[PDB]
Design an enzyme around this catalytic site. Sequence first.
Site, PDB file in Angstrom:
ATOM      1  N   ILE A  21       0.758  -1.252   0.007  1.00 25.84           N
ATOM      2  CA  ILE A  21      -0.089  -0.011   0.081  1.00 25.84           C
ATOM      3  C   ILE A  21       0.745   1.506   0.015  1.00 25.84           C
ATOM      4  O   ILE A  21       0.837   2.065  -0.826  1.00 25.84           O
ATOM      5  CB  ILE A  21      -1.164  -0.077   0.970  1.00 25.84           C
ATOM      6  CG1 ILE A  21      -2.164  -1.021   0.805  1.00 25.84           C
ATOM      7  CG2 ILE A  21      -1.594   1.448   1.356  1.00 25.84           C
ATOM      8  CD1 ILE A  21      -3.106  -1.298   1.993  1.00 25.84           C
ATOM      9  N   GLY A  22       1.607   1.495   0.936  1.00 22.75           N
ATOM     10  CA  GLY A  22       2.433   2.686   1.130  1.00 22.75           C
ATOM     11  C   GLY A  22       3.555   2.623   2.230  1.00 22.75           C
ATOM     12  O   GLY A  22       3.710   1.602   2.869  1.00 22.75           O
ATOM     13  N   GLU A  23       4.279   3.707   2.604  1.00 21.76           N
ATOM     14  CA  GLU A  23       5.330   3.791   3.415  1.00 21.76           C
ATOM     15  C   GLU A  23       5.949   4.922   3.835  1.00 21.76           C
ATOM     16  O   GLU A  23       5.488   6.025   3.406  1.00 21.76           O
ATOM     17  CB  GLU A  23       6.577   2.642   2.863  1.00 21.76           C
ATOM     18  CG  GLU A  23       7.661   3.454   2.260  1.00 21.76           C
ATOM     19  CD  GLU A  23       8.813   2.557   1.569  1.00 21.76           C
ATOM     20  OE1 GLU A  23       8.227   1.907   0.239  1.00 21.76           O
ATOM     21  OE2 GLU A  23       9.860   2.567   1.809  1.00 21.76           O
ATOM     22  N   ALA A  25       9.000   6.933   6.868  1.00 23.12           N
ATOM     23  CA  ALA A  25      10.408   7.190   7.259  1.00 23.12           C
ATOM     24  C   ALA A  25      10.967   5.962   7.994  1.00 23.12           C
ATOM     25  O   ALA A  25      11.861   5.539   8.334  1.00 23.12           O
ATOM     26  CB  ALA A  25      10.591   8.298   8.310  1.00 23.12           C
ATOM     27  N   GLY A  27       8.461   2.879   8.511  1.00 21.09           N
ATOM     28  CA  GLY A  27       7.340   1.751   8.411  1.00 21.09           C
ATOM     29  C   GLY A  27       6.706   1.715   6.986  1.00 21.09           C
ATOM     30  O   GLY A  27       6.810   2.440   6.124  1.00 21.09           O
ATOM     31  N   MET A  28       6.140   0.293   6.974  1.00 18.30           N
ATOM     32  CA  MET A  28       5.648   0.091   5.429  1.00 18.30           C
ATOM     33  C   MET A  28       3.979  -0.629   6.004  1.00 18.30           C
ATOM     34  O   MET A  28       3.809  -0.983   6.912  1.00 18.30           O
ATOM     35  CB  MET A  28       6.281  -1.012   4.954  1.00 18.30           C
ATOM     36  CG  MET A  28       6.114  -1.620   3.728  1.00 18.30           C
ATOM     37  SD  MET A  28       6.717  -2.705   2.745  1.00 18.30           S
ATOM     38  CE  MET A  28       8.190  -1.740   2.442  1.00 18.30           C
ATOM     39  N   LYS A  44       0.812  -2.302   9.410  1.00 22.28           N
ATOM     40  CA  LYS A  44       1.631  -1.468   9.407  1.00 22.28           C
ATOM     41  C   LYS A  44       2.796  -1.917  10.234  1.00 22.28           C
ATOM     42  O   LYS A  44       2.953  -2.249  11.334  1.00 22.28           O
ATOM     43  CB  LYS A  44       1.188  -0.081  10.260  1.00 22.28           C
ATOM     44  CG  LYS A  44       0.061   0.581   9.643  1.00 22.28           C
ATOM     45  CD  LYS A  44      -0.217   1.703  10.200  1.00 22.28           C
ATOM     46  CE  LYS A  44      -0.328   1.900  11.847  1.00 22.28           C
ATOM     47  NZ  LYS A  44      -0.306   3.225  12.441  1.00 22.28           N
ATOM     48  N   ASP A 139      -2.549  16.568  14.103  1.00 18.29           N
ATOM     49  CA  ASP A 139      -2.110  16.427  12.754  1.00 18.29           C
ATOM     50  C   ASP A 139      -3.328  15.956  11.626  1.00 18.29           C
ATOM     51  O   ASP A 139      -3.187  15.100  10.827  1.00 18.29           O
ATOM     52  CB  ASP A 139      -0.853  15.760  12.531  1.00 18.29           C
ATOM     53  CG  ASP A 139      -0.270  15.669  10.987  1.00 18.29           C
ATOM     54  OD1 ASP A 139      -0.352  16.858  10.470  1.00 18.29           O
ATOM     55  OD2 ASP A 139       0.418  14.672  10.607  1.00 18.29           O
TER      56      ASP A 139
HETATM   57  O1  LIG Z   1       1.653   4.362  10.932  1.00 14.98           O
HETATM   58  C1  LIG Z   1       1.974   5.634  10.854  1.00 14.98           C
HETATM   59  C2  LIG Z   1       1.050   6.550  10.526  1.00 14.98           C
HETATM   60  N1  LIG Z   1       0.089   5.732   9.325  1.00 14.98           N
HETATM   61  C3  LIG Z   1       0.324   5.566   8.085  1.00 14.98           C
HETATM   62  C4  LIG Z   1      -0.891   4.859   7.562  1.00 14.98           C
HETATM   63  C5  LIG Z   1      -0.881   4.128   6.423  1.00 14.98           C
HETATM   64  C6  LIG Z   1      -2.134   3.577   6.038  1.00 14.98           C
HETATM   65  C7  LIG Z   1      -3.067   3.420   7.246  1.00 14.98           C
HETATM   66  C8  LIG Z   1      -4.333   2.603   6.753  1.00 14.98           C
HETATM   67  N2  LIG Z   1      -4.708   2.488   5.637  1.00 14.98           N
HETATM   68  C9  LIG Z   1      -5.741   1.635   5.132  1.00 14.98           C
HETATM   69  N3  LIG Z   1      -6.167   1.853   4.027  1.00 14.98           N
HETATM   70  C10 LIG Z   1      -5.568   2.629   2.925  1.00 14.98           C
HETATM   71  C11 LIG Z   1      -5.938   1.927   1.627  1.00 14.98           C
HETATM   72  C12 LIG Z   1      -5.265   2.537   0.382  1.00 14.98           C
HETATM   73  O2  LIG Z   1      -5.564   3.869   0.485  1.00 14.98           O
HETATM   74  C13 LIG Z   1      -5.243   4.693   1.500  1.00 14.98           C
HETATM   75  C14 LIG Z   1      -5.818   3.927   2.533  1.00 14.98           C
HETATM   76  N4  LIG Z   1      -6.586   1.116   6.161  1.00 14.98           N
HETATM   77  C15 LIG Z   1      -6.248   1.215   7.440  1.00 14.98           C
HETATM   78  C16 LIG Z   1      -4.905   1.588   7.842  1.00 14.98           C
HETATM   79 CL1  LIG Z   1      -4.397   1.614   9.331  1.00 14.98          CL
HETATM   80  C17 LIG Z   1      -2.837   3.991   8.284  1.00 14.98           C
HETATM   81  C18 LIG Z   1      -1.618   4.760   8.488  1.00 14.98           C
HETATM   82  C19 LIG Z   1      -1.291   5.258   9.869  1.00 14.98           C
HETATM   83  O3  LIG Z   1      -1.606   5.454  10.981  1.00 14.98           O
HETATM   84  N5  LIG Z   1       3.203   6.062  11.168  1.00 14.98           N
HETATM   85  C20 LIG Z   1       4.173   4.962  11.665  1.00 14.98           C
HETATM   86  C21 LIG Z   1       5.136   4.565  10.391  1.00 14.98           C
HETATM   87  C22 LIG Z   1       4.713   4.659   9.111  1.00 14.98           C
HETATM   88  C23 LIG Z   1       4.245   3.679   8.261  1.00 14.98           C
HETATM   89  C24 LIG Z   1       4.042   4.213   7.026  1.00 14.98           C
HETATM   90  C25 LIG Z   1       3.824   5.310   6.488  1.00 14.98           C
HETATM   91  C26 LIG Z   1       4.218   6.497   7.385  1.00 14.98           C
HETATM   92  C27 LIG Z   1       4.406   6.079   8.534  1.00 14.98           C
HETATM   93  C28 LIG Z   1       4.877   7.339   9.665  1.00 14.98           C
HETATM   94  C29 LIG Z   1       3.889   7.305  10.908  1.00 14.98           C
END
Ligand SMILES: O=C(CN1Cc2ccc(-c3nc(NC4CCOCC4)ncc3Cl)cc2C1=O)N1CCc2ccccc2CC1
Length: 337
Positions: A21-23, A25, A27-28, A44, A139
Amino acid sequence: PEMVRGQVFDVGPRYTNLSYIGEGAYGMVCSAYDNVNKVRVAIKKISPFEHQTYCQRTLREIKILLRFRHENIIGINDIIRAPTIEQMKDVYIVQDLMETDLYKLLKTQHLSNDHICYFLYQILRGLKYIHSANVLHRDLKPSNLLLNTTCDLKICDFGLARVADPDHDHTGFLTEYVATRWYRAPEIMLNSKGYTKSIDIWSVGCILAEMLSNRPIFPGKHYLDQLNHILGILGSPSQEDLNCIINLKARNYLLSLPHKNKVPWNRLFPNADSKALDLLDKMLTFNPHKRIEVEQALAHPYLEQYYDPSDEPIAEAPFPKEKLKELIFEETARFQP
Ligand SMILES: O=C(CN1Cc2ccc(-c3nc(NC4CCOCC4)ncc3Cl)cc2C1=O)N1CCc2ccccc2CC1
């Protein structure tokens, strides 16, 4: 041990069939099939342990999200980690999988007035609970508002969250700040540390404006340019609002600027519902003392179809890297067998 993008995922055997999905600093994020509750889930991988600030943020989120229980706030379903501190290098947080977020939605989709009203209702409903726990999210922005296929909304990312501390909110002018620039209240750049509930209402106001036009309302390119954009729309602060800024550097900066007239909300947003623009005005008030509170925003005529204080619950219980690793270890123990 499954692999995704140069990173292991020690999530199995409960969670299988991963898609990226994404990433960021530290986490992934993947979707995965949960074999016990027979659904896909988000996971995550967090790897914070080298850095004290990542440790602090990982711990803040875990502690808050495990204490909170609310339909409009993302929960934690499971945490997976190694059985010992020594073998623990990553933490996997399991949460409900959400179709999209408001950032992705706004870049691709026009929102009807009914969609905007329902999204704003749910943001404020979740926020009522967050603030009733004496917590500040700090935020709020479209990418931290998750949405499922039926448009249910859940606030996520509590890594920058703090306990409210209004008596210690004052600081000097142009004091550095961590939260996302386009959603920062004007007072952050002038005299506030962002320790009051009003900081979150300003962000909600910005999100509302962005739902009305699909464009950020105050797209600053750097710290003081953010104040430039805010004042370009709200106009020059009134005498009374300047008098509340006792810090002379902040005061005299504002006094130095040429007069700017308020841009009327109905000129910026000619297709918007008039009641939405009245609530917008009250959320994007320059003076944080005069800014509408969460519970008043919920009671605003724009939200009358949804407002029901008996179904807008409050919290029952308001609130180095080596010791923080231990506290993360302690906080995640309940998910182990
Ligand atoms: O975990 C965080 C902050 N984030 C980043 C995140 C991404 C995704 C989700 C999430 N998405 C989805 N559905 C996606 C499907 C496709 O369309 C977009 C939405 N469903 C549930 C969650 Cl729970 C929740 C979160 C969240 O709470 N941090 C720690 C390390 C880290 C890791 C990854 C990126 C940035 C960071 C820094 C902060």
